[PDB]
Each structure stands twice: as C-alpha cells, then as structure tokens.
Amino acid sequence: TLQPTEAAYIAGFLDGDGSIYAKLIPRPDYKDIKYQVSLAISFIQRKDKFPYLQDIYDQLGKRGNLRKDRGDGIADYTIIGSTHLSIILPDLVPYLRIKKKQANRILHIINLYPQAQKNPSKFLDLVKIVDDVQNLNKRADELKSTNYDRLLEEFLKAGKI
Amino acid sequence: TLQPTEAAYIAGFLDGDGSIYAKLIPRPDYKDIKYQVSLAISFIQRKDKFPYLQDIYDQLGKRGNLRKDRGDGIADYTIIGSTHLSIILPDLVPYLRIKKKQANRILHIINLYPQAQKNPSKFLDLVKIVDDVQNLNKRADELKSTNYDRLLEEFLKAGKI
DNA sequence: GCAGAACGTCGTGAGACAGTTCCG
DNA sequence: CGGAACTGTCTCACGACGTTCTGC
Ligand SMILES: [Ca+2]
Ligand SMILES: [Ca+2]
Ligand SMILES: [Ca+2]
Secondary structure, eight states: OOOOOHHHHHHHHHHHHHEEEEEEEEESSSSSSSSEEEEEEEEEGGGHHHHHHHHHHHHHTTTTTTEESSSSSEEEEEEEEEHHHHHHHHHHHTTSTTTHHHHHHHHHHHHHHHHHTTOHHHHHHHHHHHHHHHHTTTTSSOOOOOHHHHHHHHHHHOOOO | OOOOHHHHHHHHHHHEEEEEEEEEEEETSSSSSSSEEEEEEEEEEEEEGHHHHHHHHHHHTTTTESOOOSSSEEEEEESHHHHHHHHHHHTTTTTTTTHHHHHHHHHHHHHHHHHHHTHHHHHHHHHHHHHHHHHHTTTSOOOOOOOHHEEEEEEEEHOOO
C-alpha cells in the first residue's frame, strides 16, 4: 500500500510541479444539463524526467494516464475522475499544503455530484465549487471564473429553473 | 526535529520547485586560490506564496535566507553553506528522487573541501565535482560546465600547478 | 582573508485547462 | 448516452546561477 512518506513526497511534489483543477465541459449530446464537470490532478515535468512520473504512477496504483510527450518536449501524468480521485486525494490531503484547499473542493464536488447530475438547482451549487477551484488557481489580478453566473442565466432562459 | 513525512514533503517540494546547485565565486581578496566553491539549495515560488516558504524555513531550523521578492514577483528561500547543508541534506536525501544525485554530490564536496582549500591540485578535483552538479542541472543538449578547464588554465598560467 | 547575504535575470519548464476523440 | 483518454498550447512561474554587497 502507499506508505506515509511516499504520500508525503507525492503531495510535496504535487504542490510544486502539479495541478488540481476542475472544469465544465459542454456536452451537446447531453439531455438537459449539457455539461459534464471534469475533475483531475496532474503532475508535469520535462520529458527527460518522465521516469519519475512513471514511478509516482506505480505508487498510485497505476491509475491515470501517462504521456511521455505532450508535443512540446514536456511530459505529464493526469488522473481524471471521481473513481481514482476518491481513493487518491484522501491519501494526499493530510500532506498537501499549497493545493490542499483545491483538493478538498474536488472531494466536496465528488460527494455532491450523484444528486446534482440530474437536478439543475443542485448542479448550479456544484458549479459554484468549480469556479472556486478555478479561482484558487488564479492570481489576484486575473478575471475570476464565472461559470455559475453564466449557467444560472442559461438555466433560466431555458426554463430549467 | 524533522519528522519523516515532514522531510519527505520538503523533499518532494524541492524536487518540484527547488534547486540544488554549486558554483565558483571569484574572490579578489583571497590569498592562494581566489575562488570559493559556494553551495546551496533553494526553494522558489510566486511571491504571493511566500508564507509557504516561511513555513519550510521554520521546519528547517530557520537556517538560510528568505526573500519576499527577488524583484520580479518571485519569492525564494536559499540555504547557503556546508554548515547548514551538512545538517539539512542528510535528512532530505532519503526522500529526494529527482535531485538526489545533486544532494549527494554536494555532500561529497563538503567532505573534500577542508583539504582542497589550500591545495590547487585538490581544489581542481573538487571543481570537477562542481561541474558534475552543474551538468546534472542541464538538459543533455546543453554546453557542459567549464569550471574545471578554465580554472586549470588559470592555475597553470599562474604557476600554482 | 574568508564566506555568507543580496541582488539581478536569460531561458525556459511548467501549469491549468480547452478541445476533440475514444470506449464499455 | 456518461465519462474518460488523447491532443494541443497560451501565459507565465520559475530555476540555476553570475555578480555584488556585508560582516568579522
Ligand atoms: Ca510550482
Ligand atoms: Ca520543477
Ligand atoms: Ca515549477
């Protein structure tokens, strides 16, 4: 299993060269809420250091997708979805510092999702947490995320709520 | 006073946003050899995250120097010298992965320095290890450090060897 | 005489997604 | 569908010193 010092290290490395983010994906094919909330954490590194990503991958149960080269000589390792994150984030959270908040927001989103997936009003509250996470990843002088505001208007205009 | 997971986290963070390097500092007022092999590890972070550095600083016995702004919106924390590094690195080496080689090469330099101090020939050998550490911090397609070649030419030309 | 503390910065190595394609 | 896997990349956030100031 993942030992304490391994999780501590990964958390430190994630606080350094990694990212914890959420996004709203337009889904034209979806049926009433034409969006899918995507959740993920990733580690990024110069391609020559790809082996170290592979090592973290193994320690995390081989969950996620490794990419030897994004195309710009950079390599990355991304773990998408509640399935993997529900198991991984709990192991890292006690050690995360810089990105600890973002991690908790993702976990919050994961627990709210089942009942928000087909309920416009609950979906909006969940979208507010998505904006929070995107803003936590922005400098203070950057335009804040406005997914909640935009979807609230969309939902009203469509009668959904 | 550093717990395993505390050291592992720091190691992971350093592997992420830190640096472990060695360099030659020209010393106009030195008496046989006019240079000093300076050693250090540093943590770098966007100014707005300075407080996380202040925390690591405290966890490492408050050794080193904290800069809220290098002058470009970037903050950093630098630990210079064998005195501090001879205590700090041994604690981090067990958990460093990416910069592990650099930490050990610095520890090596620390153990050879006393004798290389006033021995041009030994000083050069030690400088070779400085070049190794600088090379470790380069891509494979970059110019390899020339501290050894340039110092040797200076020493011969100055009749020191 | 010796060395750490500060300062300054070119050259990127990252981040944080946006899109688009793939799969049970 | 419902969601994950793969592609792609704009905008910085770093790095790893070279150089100069301070201290005993
Ligand atoms: Ca970083
Ligand atoms: Ca890095
Ligand atoms: Ca970084």
